[PDB]
Amino acid sequence: PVNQKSKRSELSQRRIRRPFSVAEVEALVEAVEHLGTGRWRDVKMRAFDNADHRTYVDLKDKWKTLVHTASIAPQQRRGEPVPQDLLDRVLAAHAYWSQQQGKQHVEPLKILDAKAQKVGA
């Protein structure tokens, strides 16, 4: 025998830069989960090794699209293959932290954060 299948088609799209690799993005979420959605500067320092004088908005944009990719907007689909492990962790922090400000849909979970101290000469 032999059958066919149907799928969805794209319409529009906008982008200037390139997508982040699973290994790269893996840090964005992991960092946002520990540092939360209130410490972007720390997320860049913990995630990106070269976050000396790097911006904090960069990581903020990547995350925004990350969570939306988990299961929010249909047109927000980056298209590229994304690990369900990240999308899940992202929505966890985005929703968990969201409860602090707004309210849309959270889950039964909690987390924490903390910094360290390193003095030299």
**Cα separation, 33 vs 6, whole angstroms:** 37
Give the residue numbers spanning the domain of 32: 21-102
Lookup: tokens for 114: 């903390």
**Cα separation, 98 vs 25, whole angstroms:** 21
Q: Token pair 């990240």 is at which residue?
A: 86
Burial class (CB within 10 angstroms; exposed 0-12, middle 13-18, buried 19+) of 12: exposed
Instruction: Decide: helix, strand or coil at residue 80.
Output: coil
Contact 88, 101 (CB under 8 A): no
**Cα separation, 87 vs 66, whole angstroms:** 7
Q: Interhelix angle for 84-101 vs 57-71, to 10°?
A: 110
Q: Tell me, what CATH number does 65's domain have?
A: 1.10.246.220
Half-sphere exposure of 23 (CA within 13 A, CB side): 0
Asked how this structure was determined, the answer is NMR
Q: Token pair 């994304």 is at which residue?
A: 82
**Cα separation, 83 vs 52, whole angstroms:** 29
Burial letters 71-103, b for 16+ CB under 10 A, else e: eeeeeeeeeeebeeebbebbbbbbbbbbeeeee
DSSP state of 50: -
For residue 91, give the nearest of 71, 111, 115 by alpha carbon.
71
Lookup: tokens for 48: 């990106």
Contact 79, 65 (CB under 8 A): no
Distance of CA 104 to the CA centre of its chain: 18
Cα-Cα end-to-end distance for the chain: 76
